[PDB]
Amino acid sequence: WPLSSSVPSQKTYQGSYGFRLGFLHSGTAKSVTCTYSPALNKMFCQLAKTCPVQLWVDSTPPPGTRVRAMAIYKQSQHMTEVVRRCPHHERCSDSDGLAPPQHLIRVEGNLRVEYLDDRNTFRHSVVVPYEPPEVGSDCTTIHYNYMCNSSCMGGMNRRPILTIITLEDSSGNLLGRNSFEVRVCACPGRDRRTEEENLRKK
Amino acid sequence: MFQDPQERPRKLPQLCTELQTTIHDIILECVYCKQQLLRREVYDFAFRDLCIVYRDGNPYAVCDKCLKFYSKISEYRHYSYSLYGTTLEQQYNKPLSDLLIRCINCQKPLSPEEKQRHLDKKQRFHNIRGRWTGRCMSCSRS
Amino acid sequence: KDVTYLTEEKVYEILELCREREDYSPLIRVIGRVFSSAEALVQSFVDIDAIRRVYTRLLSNEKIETAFLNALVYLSPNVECDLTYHNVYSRDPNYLNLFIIVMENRNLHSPEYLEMALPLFCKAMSKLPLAAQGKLIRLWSKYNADQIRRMMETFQQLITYKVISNEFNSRNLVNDDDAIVAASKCLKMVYYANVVGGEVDTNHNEEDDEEPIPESSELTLQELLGEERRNKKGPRVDPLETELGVKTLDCRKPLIPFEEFINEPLNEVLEMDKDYTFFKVETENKFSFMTCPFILNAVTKNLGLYYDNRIRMYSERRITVLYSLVQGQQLNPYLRLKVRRDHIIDDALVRLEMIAMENPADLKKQLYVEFEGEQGVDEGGVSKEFFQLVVEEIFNPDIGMFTYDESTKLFWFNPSSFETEGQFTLIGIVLGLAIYNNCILDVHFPMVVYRKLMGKKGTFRDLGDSHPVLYQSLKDLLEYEGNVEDDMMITFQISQTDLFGNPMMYDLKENGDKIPITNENRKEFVNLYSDYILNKSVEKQFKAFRRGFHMVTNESPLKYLFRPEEIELLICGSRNLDFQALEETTEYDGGYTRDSVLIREFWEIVHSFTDEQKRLFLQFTTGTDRAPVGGLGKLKMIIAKNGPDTERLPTSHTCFNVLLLPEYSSKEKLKERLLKAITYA
Ligand SMILES: [Zn+2]
Ligand SMILES: [Zn+2]
Ligand SMILES: [Zn+2]
């Protein structure tokens, strides 16, 4: 594995198109596959379960605009490390799609997906074309899947990770940026309630 | 400074990191009264998924009393019509689980459990100025 | 010879055999065993002409008619189950065929069907899913006007029949009758077929919805939410308008006049306060006729709108109180205007503008007027007087804002007006306030104005009222068959008169004086010239006027319930003058009574008057020659005794509709004095 990497800027930037995110407001029951916390700005989801993300813009971006997802460790002492799928899952037959076994993030339902390795920082990223909202909709929904558990040894190893979503032109120039934290776990509703309660207690 | 109208963080967690501070460290003013929020209110502002308002590059939040007050006024002013959740799903061609609905009294977004409760108790959802609202558990019990 | 599905040829097999065996019972067995089954029918064919031939042959026998009737009564209740519980249409989109087959039966409107068969069929049909209705409506929109009339009549007779046959009262509402509600939903289905079947102009006439920015408080709440740019959401849109993609306002000319969809018996029975409640609050067990606005007459609609206005005024009053309780600030619950008789336009402007700028929500309070120096409680009479003064002052040619046409007696916006966009905003606000306060104004605008207020640009065809001298000339130009360029020598340049009478040359197209009008471009020239006169010449002024009007009506169900022709009626009042209704509601004062000889002679005279004398009498007694929304019976006229027999003429107080009538000694003297008063006033 690449043992070192540069740190991509994580600061929110709406740009000339008002680029912002949204998430389907989900409960915290034991059966929830995916659930988002605004207080923690954090997504809690099960391994390889669909995580819907809404994209919101004030004005339509230019033709050929793209949406890129890239993962970094949230803790500053680890921000230079590349987030890779843990070896036991890198060795799993489930990587039958068009994404490298070492890519943690996969996109569901969109075959125009490009699994890209940063030539300069070696970081793993997923890109799709930007698509305007459907007739009657205000926002575009993309479906993401996380293929490794945050608790995995040899991979995330309980270190929190930040997913950065970038809105880019056809050449990769930054039109907008936003970000959120992710926890891939067997019981999202439980873990979410736990971290939220710990926050409220402080 | 947040004197750039477009490029200042919108949600409190983002503002925490932008000012290299935590929700436990930050002190903010309420946009109407400019009074300081109690830490309990700051947490609830984060839990209510509200936006930081900026004046001259200064961030402002909203305290509990002001939010409830202005929301109640807005209810009295821009009430449009009330539909059953079932009917609402058909008008928007989507299941209620996915539709954006906030608490009419305190703006907190409604959870699918609370949405189900509305269907169970045959209660309607109110359109205010073109946005939909319901009553969360902490407001249907009081 | 049993068979599971049926066709024209299969039918003919029996027509011949039944005649040959001098019997009908086998064919009756067949038709019953067929038409009682939804599946048999759905599978039998779309073959419209075959159905038409079959009905034209079968309905010629009385015994077979009773069989169709008896089969239909059996069929419909099962179809309702299929649509309500089994979603059959979602499995087989051919299910709609059933309804098409039945509706081609010409006898559905005879009374035998109206009592039971048609109601049941309406219950079934009114449950169709929206996509199916949209499929059916699109088909009906291709039918001949007489056929739309027949279908309309088929449901109109049913709604009429059920309203007349059942006793409705404040405890038994028309809203609780499934038959009438189902029939109305069917009739709605026909109504949209009439809309879509008419002439529809969607690509050259839309104007942007200009909304007044709300007060800072609502803005901050909108900013605290993710809605900074989402100020434009539209009023409550009808699901069928969404499915069809065509609005009631888009149809320039229907196949059958919209007025024929009004069911007067229903309107006489409908309790609007409860309907408006069901319109605002959806209840599973009750319907709202406001969701079917085409069936309501202007009186009934206005009463619904009046409930909306009053409920809002009352909400603003509650907000006023709540603000006072929490922040101590004392706000006025009324839209209290204070103005000087010598400066009515200025005082009204500054005040309404300060109000619109400080708080645009205040314009939605109840109007209350005070003339500086005068003393009285505004029970509407002071407001009415204020409106008369404002309208008279604004239309005076000395102000230059409007041009008056001697031929049509209508007013139109002066393109050359230097006056500020303020005055145009003021007149716009006044019109809004008049609807909001149910006061008729003596304003005379051509139909284009009300169309422009609704967000539709005036088209060539609207010149037919506003500029007859122009409309005729353009129509002539279109009808001409020679070389327009050589024979008329007109270019894309036109002349307009300035306030000082100077002809200002305006180019419809760049360097328009060098561009000749040719037979190929004349329709375009007419479109541009119409667009110039109706839009681009007054657009500066009109845009201000329209803004003023929307500042009062932006949240009103007005855009949904009414049409341009009905807006006129709300503002100016109706041209139909029912003096019998006026007699029934007239009140008497000063010692007159309904049984007084002079009063009976008065009604004999007034009933014998010509329509012009009648208009003059109303103008004299009420200040307008038109009747309010709902006719003269809504006008609380008071005939008050003005002393004993004298040589004096009668006198009037137009602000309260009081006629001061002397107790004349003879019918001829009463007639002569009354005629003289109304003629010489
Ligand atoms: Zn792993
Ligand atoms: Zn406050
Ligand atoms: Zn609440």
Which CATH number belongs to the domain containing residue B112 in this structure?
3.30.240.40
Query: Which CATH code fits C579-680?
Result: 3.30.2410.10
In terms of domains, do B40 and B78 share one?
Answer: no
Residue type, A49: K
* Closest by CA position to C640, among listed C622, C659, C655, C623: C659
Q: Is residue A133 within 8 angstroms of chain C, CB to CB?
A: no
List CB contacts (< 8 A) between C218 and chain B.
74, 77-78, 129
List CB contacts (< 8 A) between C225 and chain B.
50-51, 102, 107, 131
For residue B2, being part of any structural domain is answered with no
Q: Is residue A139 within 8 angstroms of chain C, CB to CB?
A: no
Residue of A14, A21, A25 to mutate, interface with B, max B Cβ within 10 Å: A25
Contact C336, C368 (CB under 8 A): yes
Torsion of CA C371, C372, C375, C377, to 10 degrees: 40
By DSSP bridging, strand C334-339 and strand C251-253 are: unpaired
Q: Is residue C513 within 8 angstroms of chain B, CB to CB?
A: no
In terms of domains, do B85 and B117 share one?
Answer: yes
φ, ψ for residue B20 (rounded to 5)? 45, 45
By DSSP bridging, strand C366-371 and strand C334-339 are: parallel
Q: What share of chain B is helix, strand, coil (3-state, %, to 5)?
A: 40, 20, 40
Say whether A124 counts as a known binding-site residue. no
The domain limits of chain A are 15-201
Distance CA C671, CA C121 (A): 59
Q: Which two tokens stand for residue C84?
A: 């309500």
Q: Where in chain C is the domain with CATH 3.90.1750.10?
A: 306-443
Question: Quick one: which H or E segment has residue B128?
Answer: strand B124-128
Q: Is residue A58 within 8 angstroms of chain C, CB to CB?
A: yes
**How would CATH label the architecture of A15-201?**
Sandwich (2.60)
Active site residue C439: no
Give residue B92 CA to ligand 3 midpoint distance, Å. 23
CA C8 to chain centre: 45
A98 forms beta bridges with none
For residue B6, being part of any structural domain is answered with no
Interface of B with C in 77-136 (CB under 8 A): 77-84, 87, 91, 102, 107, 122, 124, 129-131
Please report the beta strands in C372-508, taking only residues with DSSP state E, as ranges in sequence order: 402-405, 410-413, 493-497, 503-507
φ, ψ for residue C228 (rounded to 5)? -60, -35
* Closest by CA position to A24, among listed B114, B96, B91: B96
Whether residue B14 and residue A12 make contact (CB cut-off 8 A), yes or no, is yes
Q: Is residue B69 within 8 angstroms of chain C, CB to CB?
A: yes
Domain C306-443 has CATH 3.40.1400.10: no
Contact C665, C596 (CB under 8 A): no
CA B116, B118, B124, B126 torsion: positive or negative?
negative
Domain coverage including residue B104: 72-140
User: Which residue in the block uniquely carries the two structure tokens 């409309």?
Assistant: C471
Resolution (A): 3.7
Distance CA C563, CA A8 (A): 58
Q: Which two tokens stand for residue A92?
A: 């799993």
Contact C394, C374 (CB under 8 A): no
Residue type, C485: E
In terms of domains, do B43 and B85 share one?
Answer: no
Q: Where in chain C is the domain with CATH 3.30.2410.10?
A: 579-680
In sequence order, which residues have a C-beta less than 8 Å from that of residue C524 and are 6 or more positions away? none
CA C573 to chain centre: 13
In terms of domains, do B20 and B44 share one?
Answer: yes
φ, ψ for residue C240 (rounded to 5)? -65, -35
Residue spans of alpha helices (H) in C518-575: 522-531, 539-553, 558-561, 564-572
Sequence-separated contacts (24+) of C166-169 with Cβ below 8 Å: C168/C269
Ligand nearest to C-alpha A86? 1
Distance CA A127, CA A69 (A): 6
Q: Which two tokens stand for residue A49?
A: 């379960």
Say whether A89 counts as a known binding-site residue. yes
Q: Is residue B13 within 8 angstroms of chain A, CB to CB?
A: yes
Distance CA C316, CA C321 (A): 9
In terms of domains, do B78 and B99 share one?
Answer: yes
B134 forms beta bridges with B103
Q: Measuring CA to CA, how many Å separate C288 from each of B80, B129, C279?
A: 16, 22, 5
Q: Which two tokens stand for residue A142?
A: 């993309």
Name the burial class of residue C441, with classes exposed (0-12), middle (13-18) and buried (19+) by CB atoms within 10 angstroms of its CB.
buried
By DSSP bridging, strand C651-653 and strand C658-663 are: antiparallel
DSSP assignment, residue C370? E
Residue of B4, B8, B12, B14 to mutate, interface with A, max A Cβ within 10 Å: B14
Question: Quick one: which H or E segment has residue C434?
Answer: helix C421-436
Residue spans of alpha helices (H) in C105-262: 111-112, 118-125, 130-140, 145-165, 178-197, 216-224, 239-244
Helix (H, G, I), strand (E, B) or coil at C471: helix
Helix (H, G, I), strand (E, B) or coil at A143: strand
Give residue A8 CA to ligand 1 midpoint distance, Å. 23
B54 forms beta bridges with B59
For residue B79, being part of any structural domain is answered with yes
In terms of domains, do B76 and B30 share one?
Answer: no
B29 forms beta bridges with B36, B60
List CB contacts (< 8 A) between C322 and chain B.
72-73, 76
List CB contacts (< 8 A) between C230 and chain A.
138
User: Which residue in the block uniquely carries the two structure tokens 């040359």?
Assistant: C505
In terms of domains, do B55 and B87 share one?
Answer: no
Name the burial class of residue C515, with classes exposed (0-12), middle (13-18) and buried (19+) by CB atoms within 10 angstroms of its CB.
middle
Which region holds residue C245: left if phi is over 0, alpha if psi is between -120 and 50, else beta? left
Domain count, chain B: 2
Edge-to-edge strand list for the sheet holding C651-653: C587-589, C638-644, C658-663, C651-653
Q: Measuring CA to CA, how many Å separate C545 from each of C188, C294, C549?
A: 35, 29, 6
Which region holds residue C608: left if phi is over 0, alpha if psi is between -120 and 50, else beta? alpha
